[PDB]
Amino acid sequence: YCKPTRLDLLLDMPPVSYDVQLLHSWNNNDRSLNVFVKEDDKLIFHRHPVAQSTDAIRGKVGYTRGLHVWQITWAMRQRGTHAVVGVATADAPLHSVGYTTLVGNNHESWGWDLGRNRLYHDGKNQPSKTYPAFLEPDETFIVPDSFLVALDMDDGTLSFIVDGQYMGVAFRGLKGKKLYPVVSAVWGHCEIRMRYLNGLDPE
Amino acid sequence: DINNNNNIVEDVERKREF
């Protein structure tokens, strides 16, 4: 549960400008059509209040190498029954009927369910895993409104940092892919912000 | 409903996938 040195270095760097944030923000050309990027606030998408629907959207950049960190802000009261945060390849589906853990439900996505404290990957075929891993079985862990996602494409891992605490590696095995930030949501009018902070090339 | 959604608004993504 100790931050890697490379991550400590990145987290120390001043964060990138809004102009650069916009290069990595939510892609309005790579979404469920039941969400949209807000015109006046392009770091944020809005989900239309569609019943029995789960909807996702990918960030503009798919990372293949280096360490990358971004910030998610997702207000507790706008999470509903299935608030999932992670990464996906370009082939991951961005919608399902019903309310589900869309991100992590297939071989193309890896998600942390913020309400369940559970990780999903190929979730129709594999069991979910408790995260953070230190939680005893019935134990509650409240994810705050904002937290960080760390994708290390060189090591091939996804981890999370919550209120400055490294929560451990969530997923492994990601080397050689091209992975995009993604969230799946079920709450009507939820607005979810993603802010890219920095990246560090390999070496 | 339980997720602040309703049946009145169109499921555009579902109709796009039809």
Q: Which residues of chain B does A102 touch, with a Cβ-Cβ cutoff of 8 Å? A: none
Q: Write out the two tokens for A194.
A: 């993603």
Resolution of this PDB entry, in A?
A: 2.0
CA distance, residue A132 to nearest chain B CA (Å):
25
Q: Which residues of chain A does B14 touch, with a Cβ-Cβ cutoff of 8 Å? A: 53, 95, 97
Residue A132, preceding peptide bond in cis (omega within 30° of 0): yes
Does A50 contact B16 at a Cβ distance shorter than 8 Å?
no
CA distance, residue B14 to nearest chain A CA (Å):
8
Query: Could you give the CA distance from residue A105 to residue A129 in angstroms, rounded to a whole number?
Result: 13
Q: Which residues of chain A does B2 touch, with a Cβ-Cβ cutoff of 8 Å? A: 80-81
Which experiment gave this structure? X-ray
User: What residue segments make up the domains of chain A, in order of their start?
Assistant: 1-203
The amino acid present at A115, given as its one-letter code, is G
